Design a protein around this motif. Structure first.
Motif, PDB file in Angstrom:
ATOM      1  N   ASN C 118       0.857  -1.175   0.000  1.00  0.00           N
ATOM      2  CA  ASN C 118       0.000   0.000   0.000  1.00  0.00           C
ATOM      3  C   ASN C 118       0.896   1.227   0.000  1.00  0.00           C
ATOM      4  OD1 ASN C 118      -1.366   2.308   1.751  1.00  0.00           O
ATOM      5  ND2 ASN C 118      -3.014   1.117   0.789  1.00  0.00           N
ATOM      6  N   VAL C 119       0.863   1.972  -1.102  1.00  0.00           N
ATOM      7  CA  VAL C 119       1.692   3.165  -1.249  1.00  0.00           C
ATOM      8  C   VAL C 119       1.570   4.140  -0.081  1.00  0.00           C
ATOM      9  CG1 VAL C 119       2.153   5.159  -2.660  1.00  0.00           C
ATOM     10  CG2 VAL C 119       1.655   2.986  -3.730  1.00  0.00           C
ATOM     11  N   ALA C 120       0.341   4.466   0.305  1.00  0.00           N
ATOM     12  CA  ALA C 120       0.102   5.386   1.412  1.00  0.00           C
ATOM     13  C   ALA C 120       0.730   4.909   2.717  1.00  0.00           C
ATOM     14  CB  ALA C 120      -1.389   5.580   1.606  1.00  0.00           C
ATOM     15  N   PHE C 122       3.201   2.585   3.075  1.00  0.00           N
ATOM     16  CA  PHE C 122       4.639   2.509   2.853  1.00  0.00           C
ATOM     17  C   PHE C 122       5.238   3.872   3.180  1.00  0.00           C
ATOM     18  CE2 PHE C 122       8.420   2.952   0.143  1.00  0.00           C
ATOM     19  CZ  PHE C 122       9.098   1.787   0.458  1.00  0.00           C
ATOM     20  N   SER C 123       4.708   4.903   2.526  1.00  0.00           N
ATOM     21  CA  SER C 123       5.161   6.279   2.712  1.00  0.00           C
ATOM     22  C   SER C 123       5.061   6.682   4.167  1.00  0.00           C
ATOM     23  CB  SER C 123       4.318   7.239   1.862  1.00  0.00           C
ATOM     24  OG  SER C 123       4.637   8.592   2.139  1.00  0.00           O
TER      25      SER C 123
ATOM     26  N   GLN D  51       3.717  11.319   0.332  1.00  0.00           N
ATOM     27  CA  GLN D  51       4.085  10.238  -0.566  1.00  0.00           C
ATOM     28  C   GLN D  51       5.109  10.797  -1.560  1.00  0.00           C
ATOM     29  OE1 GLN D  51       0.210   8.492  -1.984  1.00  0.00           O
ATOM     30  NE2 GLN D  51      -0.349   9.051   0.115  1.00  0.00           N
ATOM     31  N   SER D  54       8.317  11.133   0.359  1.00  0.00           N
ATOM     32  CA  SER D  54       8.873   9.832   0.691  1.00  0.00           C
ATOM     33  C   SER D  54       9.599   9.198  -0.491  1.00  0.00           C
ATOM     34  CB  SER D  54       7.762   8.900   1.167  1.00  0.00           C
ATOM     35  OG  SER D  54       7.216   9.374   2.379  1.00  0.00           O
ATOM     36  N   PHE D  55       9.002   9.294  -1.672  1.00  0.00           N
ATOM     37  CA  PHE D  55       9.613   8.717  -2.847  1.00  0.00           C
ATOM     38  C   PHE D  55      10.685   9.602  -3.444  1.00  0.00           C
ATOM     39  CE2 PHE D  55       5.907   6.114  -2.261  1.00  0.00           C
ATOM     40  CZ  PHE D  55       6.425   4.855  -2.525  1.00  0.00           C
ATOM     41  N   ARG D  72      -3.273   3.228  -5.461  1.00  0.00           N
ATOM     42  CA  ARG D  72      -3.239   2.957  -4.023  1.00  0.00           C
ATOM     43  C   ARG D  72      -2.141   2.005  -3.558  1.00  0.00           C
ATOM     44  NH1 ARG D  72      -5.225   6.143  -1.901  1.00  0.00           N
ATOM     45  NH2 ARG D  72      -7.107   7.390  -2.345  1.00  0.00           N
ATOM     46  N   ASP D  73      -2.118   0.816  -4.145  1.00  0.00           N
ATOM     47  CA  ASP D  73      -1.121  -0.173  -3.796  1.00  0.00           C
ATOM     48  C   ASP D  73      -0.644  -0.926  -5.021  1.00  0.00           C
ATOM     49  OD1 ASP D  73      -3.649  -2.304  -2.229  1.00  0.00           O
ATOM     50  OD2 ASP D  73      -3.411  -1.548  -4.282  1.00  0.00           O
ATOM     51  N   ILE D  74       0.574  -1.444  -4.913  1.00  0.00           N
ATOM     52  CA  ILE D  74       1.234  -2.145  -5.991  1.00  0.00           C
ATOM     53  C   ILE D  74       1.530  -3.573  -5.589  1.00  0.00           C
ATOM     54  CG2 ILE D  74       3.363  -2.172  -7.339  1.00  0.00           C
ATOM     55  CD1 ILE D  74       3.335   0.885  -7.213  1.00  0.00           C
TER      56      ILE D  74
END
Lengths: 131, 130, 130, 134
Positions: C118-120, C122-123, D51, D54-55, D72-74
């Motif tokens: 989950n990108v959110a 993870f960040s 985000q 962070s990246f 949302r997710d990978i």
């Protein structure tokens, strides 16, 4: 009839250093092998190289290019958005360079006569070169 | 005037993160410190910050910028020759960009309809325009 | 002996694109031309090129580089002061990467056993690295 | 929760100019606006900002980041693949910077006692050194 590293460089107009680099981050590895090892790039490698160059031209990073190349087709919609994004980056840059040029030509006309300038005074002037 | 790093950042539209870096590399160290470690920026520091911003704008490396900011006066030629050169650099960039944008139009025209764009086909087509 | 832009690209570990660009911005233009009307580089050009390569290796900007070369010799004291600056800049970057990498491995190991990342989130976890 | 552009800039430790740019390239747009025109950033906008940071911190480009934050997710397999590639780029830079510092230590030692650095001579020593330790 594969190519030596130096040959490939001339062919695709890439420096050898850049090839060792791409091979190192696994973005483009030579396909052939003789015996006792040995590099050797192929005609398929050239297409991928050209592919990489096509996307750098458009402003994409090695990361995205890697993603792109690892696919045959990338579905229009999402792709156009990707490219359209790079377009906005370019437009913003185009506007920014226009101003910078104007600021410099302006500064030049203002200080050409001075044999010497106070570093601070020459900054405050360049700073007021914004509203 | 006195600025705690965060207030300094805000008034100079620079991040607190950047200020710590300029401090680390010794490009811009605060003229004063609080008695408990916190850094305090002066109006002078604000000018040094403004200056770093100005010359970065002219294309000067961070190393040359430091040397410049360490001298009250300097031969005007140092700036004149620099802007002159950058002007050519930026003119080549304008052209380079105007062309890329033009090529994108073409790219959009050719695959805007497709359900997928063939990377190999796309690249060879774009290569045609170089 | 001399070289055509392509052979010169090989002699001097550079590209034709690069050489055309240097020619355009007047940082390095070929000292000669063939009767056919092609760029023809001198052994002198080759050295100017080596000089451009060096210095560029240091954080020097194209413009600064032209000035360096035209100067022929520069005051050692100021020069080594700029190089020592760039040294701090590089050491800061080196430690920055060290941090980014360890942060990378932490997150990598944490989300390793999940189905989706989950990108959110993870960040969020990364951010919480303070 | 709500932020004006300055309040928002301070919160994510980003500049106002950076926020305007993200707005311009559609990377991060204010989700709500004031009746007088001013941008009103939301909690939701706050996550997207983090985000992006962070990246960025990891070294990803804005384009890459847009693709990431747009989903949302990978899938873990693919995510790690992407993290691994990026991790290589960082190792390449780390190694390159090490050589540069090294090259600079040698050059510093060479002209340390000279009043002037001859450009052409310097360039020869740097190139001989870089190649010599090849």
């Amino acid at each position: 009839l594969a190519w030596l590293i130096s040959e490939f460089a001339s062919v695709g107009d890439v420096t050898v250093r850049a090839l060792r680099y791409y091979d190192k981050i696994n973005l483009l590895k030579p396909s052939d092998y003789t015996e006792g090892g040995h590099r050797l790039y192929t005609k398929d490698d050239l297409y991928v190289l050209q592919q990489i160059q096509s996307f750098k031209h458009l402003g994409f990073s090695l990361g995205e290019i890697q993603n792109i190349i690892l696919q045959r087709d990338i579905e229009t919609e999402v792709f156009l958005r990707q490219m359209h994004f790079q377009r906005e980056v370019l437009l913003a840059e185009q506007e920014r360079i226009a101003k910078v040029l104007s600021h410099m030509d302006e500064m030049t006309k203002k200080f050409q006569k001075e044999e010497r300038v106070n570093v601070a005074l020459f900054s405050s002037f360049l700073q007021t070169f914004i509203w």
